[PDB]
Design an enzyme around this catalytic site. Structure first.
Site: not given
Ligand SMILES: [Ca+2]
Length: 240
Positions: A45, A93, A186, A188-189
């Site tokens: 995402h 994801d 922020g 994320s990942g």
């Protein structure tokens, strides 16, 4: 990271900052993990939009020169084939980014250690989340890399009615939920570093939190379980 503390500079050397170009400036949008000198692992995402991306390794303070940074472009983006942007709860994801150039490994830049395929952590295993994400729900990004102790919550408990229920799948890892500490936009990942056999390995890729807020009691931060994608990851790096 909500409820965290500043990490010692360069103490999590595999952590990267994924940024996109906004006009003539750059903005941090997600975290990621350096897994090869020329490959970064992040959330699908984070790279769903068609923006120009760049990766920064050896970073600590987003607004100041730390004298340890390396900036590199992104040559290729490989999103998991089953990723559905309209259903983050379905999982998948995860994305791999091939960097335009190989970064130099040193005291501030190192490869992240990945778990053996299929590895599942026992309930309440010691892990830490790191990132420059929001320090409060609807707040602002952190200038310096933050870290927070975030123990796991096994699937049986996390998928129960008292927690996330059926929104979580076995292909995910839940951590936290103490109502004080959590990942946030922020982050994320980014990675979830967990202590296994004496070393920290990246067991999760930050995926999502509750719509009610980042730090919500019994609503642990949810991560893509890296160990469920080892074969996929190896296949991509070996043929790209
Ligand atoms: Ca900096």
């Amino acid at each position: 990271v909500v409820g965290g503390t500043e990490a010692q500079r360069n103490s999590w050397p595999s952590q990267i900052s994924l940024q996109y170009r906004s006009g003539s400036s750059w903005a941090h949008t997600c975290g990621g993990t350096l897994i090869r000198q020329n490959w970064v692992m992040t959330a699908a995402h984070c790279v769903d939009r068609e923006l120009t991306f760049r990766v920064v390794v050896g970073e600590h303070n987003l607004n100041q020169n730390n004298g340890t940074e390396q900036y590199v472009g992104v040559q290729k983006i490989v999103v998991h084939p089953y990723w559905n942007t309209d259903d983050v709860a379905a999982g998948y994801d995860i994305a791999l980014l091939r960097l335009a150039q190989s970064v130099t490994l040193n005291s501030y830049v190192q490869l992240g250690v990945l778990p053996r395929a299929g590895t599942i952590l026992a309930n309440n295993s010691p892990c830490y989340i790191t990132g420059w994400g929001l320090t409060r729900t609807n707040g602002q990004l952190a200038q310096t890399l933050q870290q927070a102790y975030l123990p796991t919550v096994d699937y049986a408990i996390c998928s129960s009615s008292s927690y996330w229920g059926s929104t979580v799948k076995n292909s995910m890892v839940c951590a936290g939920g103490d109502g004080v500490r959590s990942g946030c936009q922020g982050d994320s990942g980014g990675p979830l570093h967990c202590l296994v056999n004496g070393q920290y390995a990246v067991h999760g890729v930050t995926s999502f939190v509750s719509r009610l807020g980042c730090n919500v009691t019994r609503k642990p931060t949810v991560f893509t379980r890296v160990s469920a994608y080892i074969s996929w990851i190896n296949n991509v790096i070996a043929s790209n």
